[PDB]
Each structure stands twice: as structure tokens, then as C-alpha cells.
Symmetry: D2
Subunit: 117 residues, 4 copies
């Protein structure tokens, strides 16, 4: 069974992003539907897969990371609106049998994502 997972990495300290609030949305033609909310654990991942089994369906999604609140909780005092506040990763799942690992490699001034393994 394919599963959707994520991983937040803080490249300002080379450490997992701990406590990063995130939300998963299913995206359709008329609107978006919240599927799940989660908080990254001590390894920067989620204790449970964001989607697994029959819940992982072919479609379009959005992973929204509260990266700005995280860096503010780490002591960063940045002028608002921060350049990196809520990071929105829009992506599509075309094959429900394959795993989809969509991490976030983020600083207050940069971020990158990819389809990992």
C-alpha cells in the first residue's frame, strides 16, 4: 500500500524541524478540502503517514507548512509579513500504489522540495 509522508529539515541549524504544524488539502476544481492536520515529531516527520491505504487516492493535493511560526518559535525575530511564512507545496499523485515522500528543506529565506524515496 502506497503512503504519503513528509519531512521538515531546518538548514539554518542542520537539524530536523520539530513542532512544525502542517495541513493536507485535497484540491479539486471547485475548492480545497482539509484532509489532515499534523505536527512534526523529534525527527521532523509525522508519527503516522499523512495518507495510506484507501485514503491515498489519485488526485491533486496541497501540503501547507507553518514554517514561519516554527522559526519564530526558534527565536528568529523577522519583520512581518515574513518572506517565508506558510509554505504551500502543491503536487499531484498519479499512481496510488507508489509511495510519495514530499519533504521540505527550508530556511527563513529559501525552501526546496522534491519527490524522494
Amino acid at each position: 500500500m502506497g503512503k504519503l509522508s513528509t519531512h521538515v529539515l531546518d538548514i539554518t541549524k542542520g537539524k530536523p524541524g520539530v513542532g512544525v504544524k502542517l495541513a493536507l488539502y485535497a484540491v479539486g476544481p471547485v475548492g480545497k478540502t482539509l484532509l489532515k492536520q499534523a505536527v512534526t515529531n523529534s525527527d521532523g516527520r509525522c508519527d503516522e503517514p499523512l495518507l495510506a491505504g484507501e485514503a491515498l487516492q489519485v488526485g491533486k493535493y496541497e501540503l501547507v507548512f507553518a514554517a514561519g511560526d516554527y522559526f519564530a518559535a526558534q527565536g528568529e525575530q523577522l519583520p512581518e509579513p515574513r518572506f517565508v511564512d506558510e509554505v504551500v507545496i502543491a503536487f499531484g499523485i498519479a499512481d496510488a500504489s507508489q509511495n510519495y515522500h514530499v519533504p521540505l528543506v527550508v530556511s527563513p529565506w529559501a525552501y526546496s522540495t522534491y519527490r524522494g524515496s
Copy 2:
């Protein structure tokens, strides 16, 4: 006076992303407002800045890159829905007097962005 600019780089071929359609949005409490549509030129940039002068205001923004259409137009046939289709780059501008360069370094399976 500050200006907003972007730049698209295709890392499957090490060339600028040419012909990438763009849509810039201001994001507020009640919703989003379309500010500008544009297309990347032969250098993967815009002939005019996305925002400049008084049009560059303090606030939240969303710069959407029609990257999936670009890679489909380059011959890359990929099953639907594509992992990289419309790339949403949400960011904030805290100082209207500064230049903000928000490029995109993109493949069909990865993208990166940063404040340049």
C-alpha cells in the same frame, strides 16, 4: 523604489525556462487578487518587473508557475496528475523599498526557490 522579479531555470537541460506562464497574486484575509499575468522570455525572465514602484506593497503574495505545461510543451510526456504542475510560491514582502527576486529552479520532480 522596490521591484519584484523572477527567473525560471530548467534543470533537466541546464537552460532558462522559456515560455513559462506566470500569475502573481496578492493574498489577503478574504481571498486572493490577481495582480499580473506574464510569460518568461528567452532568458527565463520577464521583460518588465512583476511589481515596481507604488505597485509593490507590504503584504503576502503568491507567484504561480505553470511548470507542468512547460514540461509538457518540451516533449516530456508524464502521466496525469503531474507531480509538478502549477507551482505555488507563497511569500511575504516586509519592505516595499527593497528588490525581491524570487526565482524558480525546477524539474518535473523537484523545485527550489529563495530570496535572490
Copy 3:
């Protein structure tokens, strides 16, 4: 020396969205007396190494270089690129300051770009 640390890597092919399978690599220690070859490996079907590159008492404080034969990998995948390839052997130099901790240094690579970081 500590027994608890381990050096690892992970090759991700972002032209395919798949792990880089069959990529040859070598680990070097780098110091004032030169570079010392420590291990050669080939990435498995998950783009990782079946055995750790360095771990435990063999994992020591100092400078290191991981060398990825990215150019041969992409050539083996059908990419026809004029030589010398822009991305051929990728050299990731990095330092290890605490021998008891784990260091995961992955490679996110295309024939025209790559990135690396200290992961978890």
C-alpha cells in the same frame, strides 16, 4: 573512540523522481597528508548503501569527501551529453565535528544541478 555514529548518504534522481540506482561512489578522508580512500560502494534500489560508508570507531572527527559518479549514472540512463559533462563526478566536501553522532549527507542531482545538506 565512540561506537555510536554512522555516516550515510542517499542519491535522488530528480530527472526521474526516483532514487539513483547503480551510482558508484567513494568516501575519502581529507587531511594535511593527502586524501585516503576509505570505501567504494554502489547505490542499491533505494538509492542507498547496503552497508554504512563509515560507522563507530572508524567514524572519526575530520574532513571528508564523498565522490559520486553522477556522470556515468546519467549516461547509463540514456542521456547523451557532450563531454566533459557539466555534472560528472560530484565532490561533496564536508566536516564531521562529533564522531558519536549520525551524519546523513544526501545528493539531489540532475545532469545540470545538484544540492546537498545535512539531513536526519
Copy 4:
């Protein structure tokens, strides 16, 4: 005709890396040859191209950046040896007629490069 250039970006503050010392080497079968030593300017670039005209030839090169020294001068207090100290970017130039722009997007715990434009 072709020109080789670079650009250092500090993604910990969202600013160009200013004062970054660098060195360009040619890489051949019998050893490496220093081509140029330079320092980034206020825009994180070099006032002159690293290689231009007849100096730009087909072959392998290495750009070495003293990134760790730069982060020390910016106040970052990291144990030694730093995870990121001297960043080595090995790359090959196949067509001396084309411009090659090879930037460095770096934090003390991450870096990326690409064939830019």
C-alpha cells in the same frame, strides 16, 4: 566569446554572500592548476568574469569557496571542523563558446549549485 561567472547567496539572511574568498582550478590528469583567486563583491558576484575569451577552454574545473570563513565572520559559532567549510564545486565545460554561470546557494548546513543563465 564564452564567460564563466558565479554568484554566492546566503540563504540564512536572504542576502548575497559578500567577501567570500574563492579559487578557480583547472582539473587535468596530472593535477590541478590554480587559475584565479578572487572575492565576491557587494552583489555576491565577481567584478570580473572568472574566465573569459581564450582563458575559457574545454575541460574540467573546480570552484572552491571559503564558505566556512564567511560564516565565521558573520558571527556563526560552529564547532570545528565545520560541516560546511570550503565548498568544492566540480564541473565540466563542454562548449567554450557558451556562457557558464555557476552560483552557490549556501547555508552552514546546506548548499546547491546549478548551470545558471
